[PDB]
Amino acid sequence: VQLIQSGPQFKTPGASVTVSCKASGYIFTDYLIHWVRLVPGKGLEWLGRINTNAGLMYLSHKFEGRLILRRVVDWRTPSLGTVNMELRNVRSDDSAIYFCGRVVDGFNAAGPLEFWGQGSPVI
Amino acid sequence: AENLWVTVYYGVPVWKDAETTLFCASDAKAYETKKHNVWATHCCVPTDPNPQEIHLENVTEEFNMWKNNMVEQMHTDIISLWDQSLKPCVKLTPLCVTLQCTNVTNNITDDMRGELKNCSFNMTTELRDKKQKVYSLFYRLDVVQINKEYRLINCNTSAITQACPKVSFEPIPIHYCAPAGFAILKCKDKKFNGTGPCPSVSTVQCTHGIKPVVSTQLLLNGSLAEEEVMIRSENITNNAKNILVQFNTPVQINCTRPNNNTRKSIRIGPGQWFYATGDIIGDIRQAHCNVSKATWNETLGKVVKQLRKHFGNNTIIRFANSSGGDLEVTTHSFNCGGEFFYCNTSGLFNSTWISDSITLPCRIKQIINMWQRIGQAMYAPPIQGVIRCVSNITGLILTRDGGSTNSTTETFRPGGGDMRDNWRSELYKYKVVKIEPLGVAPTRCKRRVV
Amino acid sequence: EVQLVESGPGLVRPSETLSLTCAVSGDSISTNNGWSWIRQTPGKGLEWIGYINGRSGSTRYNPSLQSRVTISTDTSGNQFSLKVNSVTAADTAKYYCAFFWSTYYKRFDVWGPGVRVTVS
Amino acid sequence: VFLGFLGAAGSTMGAASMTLTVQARNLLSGIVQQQSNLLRAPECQQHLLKLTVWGIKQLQARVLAVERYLRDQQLLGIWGCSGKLICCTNVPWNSSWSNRNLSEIWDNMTWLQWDKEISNYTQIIYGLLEESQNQQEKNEQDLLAL
């Protein structure tokens, strides 16, 4: 099981930032994917999660008008797929390390994360 | 210990689970005169002559609709037929040129503002030293603004082909039939949940007629449950799997595309034609679908009553609309009278259960990626006149969000998922087995040597 | 399961025909092939007389009586019978009614108590 | 044809042995093998030529039904049963393969249950049946017989 994230990004305030997490080695569908933001001066904050089979988004109620999650699958190759994130209206308040992770098997209705990526970071 | 000898029997009624290739067949009646129907050409073998069904007394067999290779085969063959019928069409490579576009403002309602673009461009001609200035209307969802300059969306990744104007992708019913040496077993129990030891089994020559209708969220024109609404899933407590809900009564939905629409053809080359959308006759308004309100209440009451059997009879069940970053994961996609619709179902999945009509606004597209490919794209020619479809909603694809709060509630939303879930809703009753006629057993006879 | 009951004269004179019958209870004799007669003669032991196939009426007789014995059925009475012509003192014996089932799957016999017949 | 194709499947071995022609008749005759033998052209055929992939899938299905049929016939021939739906052999039952009496299996078991009981002795039994026939031919090539 491996989660591979894209590199660091810098953006002009008000611009959107898009980051991504490529997942492999387990069936991509099943096992919800969660996003968590780390702010060195505040701690961890949950942003939302995506249902990789259905293509459904669930968000933390701070970001409904700002954060969009998407997924890409190919029924051909069940062991591979990606999750993308788009965050709009980026401000200095959003300087953080953005992490990708996967829920512990048996906990799709919850969100402990067993596997983690690297952290973007953004600005 | 008796003094017995081996006796060999041939023609013994024994079988093993097996994977194979089914050959497909159709009812050569009204469908025989369709001529250009894709399904009527492929599933050519005539069937359903008052077909046989044989009850097997005392046979109990294990079924598993989630591991049923018949669905995977149906999926693969549908894709192959679509590629084969598009392969010999025009290939509209010459259209990915800069387009000069303005808004259509000619008697448009408020809900259509910015929906249509009037685009002119320099197209190739049949004689290769000339160019022509032509124009066509496009839907907003088919173009990309670049740098009034636009391009078609599918320029970065693929050529766009054009469906051939005479090919009809109408989902007439087809039947799957076993090859010699194989048999299809059918599970007849009413209230069968898709898995396990089905006690009432019969053999068939072929499956019932199945219409290969392709849609998301709401399953259209399938079979109905025999007695009660059925809820089936691979694992009901795992909010990652989809829930397939089969209604025991249809909900009628009336879909239309208003706007009289005209069509014109343009030569792009020597016998190579492109179909353009011409000016709309009459006014311009949105496509939409009508669902009876009382009916889409009574049938949710039935779905909820059945969901409570798995989630608790003191649990609050609420429905909510789809949420995601795409069109293909939030709308009800279907093909109607040849055109592709993407309808908004948030007007249906909006209620809480604690123990006139609904109008669904709808958008349409002409450039379809189809299935899940990145390259490969199709342009659907416009259809003249107006379009009206009357369809039966026979089932739902639902997902749960996960748990919620200590108030004990569950939230269900229209789901997405692979196209295979549409076929699993019809083929759940069938299994394919290989017949193995030899066997041996003890008897009192001995070969008499002479 | 059947019961076999024999009946007939316990005495026959030289050159007379001996006639013995057997009633069958519990099953049919119009079927169930293998209805037969067996003879037990003191000083000789057991031998077959022959048998009849209830379904077709065909018979087979031990060669020693090929020209002397007739076996036939009364399917209405559900009884069958044995007739042996030109009976002599040498034919004094204990006669039995028997049912022999012998197929690929089962083997069993049913025997009646028999009739002892004296021949002068 | 196909009027009770697996009708005896839930019945006992004894009763099911009386329907053997029912299953035998359906091994070489699927729908496509009937359409292929019409006096009139089937008409469909052009489809399977224009699109050669479908033509190949159909032939593979037809060839396989024939190969499976012939392999079963070859085994019956090797074991000394040319024709016949039921044939007796000289191989004794081991009472290890299955240890039940005749009155238990012919009357209480179905063929499916039997098949699931002795499936891992199938190759041993087939091997013995072949050896038995070879021994019989060796004895036939002796004019003093037995």
Next chain:
Amino acid sequence: VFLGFLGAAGSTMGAASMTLTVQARNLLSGIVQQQSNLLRAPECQQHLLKLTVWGIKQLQARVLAVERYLRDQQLLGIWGCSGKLICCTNVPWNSSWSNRNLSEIWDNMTWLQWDKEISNYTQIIYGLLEESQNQQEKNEQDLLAL
């Protein structure tokens, strides 16, 4: 091979019954089935691969000849005639199917004429032949025989 393939077609049923191997030998061996079995490569083969439509038409013809042959052999096997060109059965003639004496049909009719006289009784007769064989096997599984 093929030296008088339908030579008896205009002859009487009696005389024609003496040429049965002549037609039997030509059911599995057309020209292409001889070329396909040369020790040398046939050479032509590349044509049928370069152009797959012709390759498919040839295979369909070959597969069909085999399927038709095997179906006739299966019926003879089911009816209790494994091998033999002429076999006797236990099914009586109905005298409804055709009502002629032996001296009329064997000496005056050709097989083509006969075929056109009883063609709509073919399935009845075949059904009876199968029932007869099943009854015979039921009688064989009785060690007291007849």
Next chain:
Amino acid sequence: VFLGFLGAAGSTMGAASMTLTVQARNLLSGIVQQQSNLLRAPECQQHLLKLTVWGIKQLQARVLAVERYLRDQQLLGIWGCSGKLICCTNVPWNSSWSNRNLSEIWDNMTWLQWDKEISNYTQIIYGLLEESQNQQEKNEQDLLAL
């Protein structure tokens, strides 16, 4: 299967006659004919459909194995040997075809050597075997027999 496929090839005709099932079992069962009969899909199959030339070559190989098998079986049937690996006939040996005694050929020659000695009399012998069977059937249709 294939555990001594041509093992008797260098042995004498007499000894080699005892291994006849060994070669018979390998005429209808190559590797591809085993893969084609798996309960699971073979997986490979998509390759042979995507590229139809390979699909055709495989079918031609499978069809040919079947046709060759059936032709040999048809000849045995015509000659009056339905089944059996060894059968006696009524055709006398000519002593022109080969002029050796039994003690020389069964003990000193291999089958390959024998085949290279009488190969140009093969068709004569086959023709006689067919005539013999036809004569036998003519005699069978006489209720006074011999």
